[PDB]
Amino acid sequence: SKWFNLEKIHSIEVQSLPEFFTNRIPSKTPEVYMRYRNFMVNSYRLNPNEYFSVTTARRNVSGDAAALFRLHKFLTKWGLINYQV
């Protein structure tokens, strides 16, 4: 995924998970988004042979479960995680 970069946010992400890009919700910002996102991607990349689950994400990261589920769904859809299980 050449388009993806751990230090940036691509237009694909802004369009797909608008809840973090409203400029009107203090708790949901690009900074918060990158924290959650990078944790999932970094976790999967550590052990690509294993399926990184929503349950593991919620157990390891403190955050809104529904938002984490949506983030996980997005990363799955675009092949950023669980692409070599």
Swiss-Prot record:
Name the UniProt record assigns to this protein: SWI/SNF complex subunit SWI3
Limits of the SWIRM domain: 1-85
Full-sequence portion shown in this chain: 311 to 395 of 825
Effect of D64A: Loss of DNA-binding
Taxonomic classification: Eukaryota, Fungi, Dikarya, Ascomycota, Saccharomycotina
Function of the protein: Involved in transcriptional activation. Component of the SWI/SNF complex, an ATP-dependent chromatin-remodeling complex, which is required for the positive and negative regulation of gene expression of a large number of genes. It changes chromatin structure by altering DNA-histone contacts within a nucleosome, leading eventually to a change in nucleosome position, thus facilitating or repressing binding of gene-specific transcription factors.
Superkingdom to which the source organism belongs: Eukaryota
Annotated phenotype, changing N82A: Loss of DNA-binding
Compartments, record wording: Nucleus
Oligomeric form and interacting partners: Interacts with RTT102, SWP82 and the N-terminus of SNF2. Component of the SWI/SNF global transcription activator complex. The 1.14 MDa SWI/SNF complex is composed of 11 different subunits: one copy each of SWI1, SNF2/SWI2, SNF5, SNF12/SWP73, ARP7/SWP61, ARP9/SWP59; two copies each of SWI3, SNF6, SNF11, SWP82; and three copies of TAF14/SWP29.
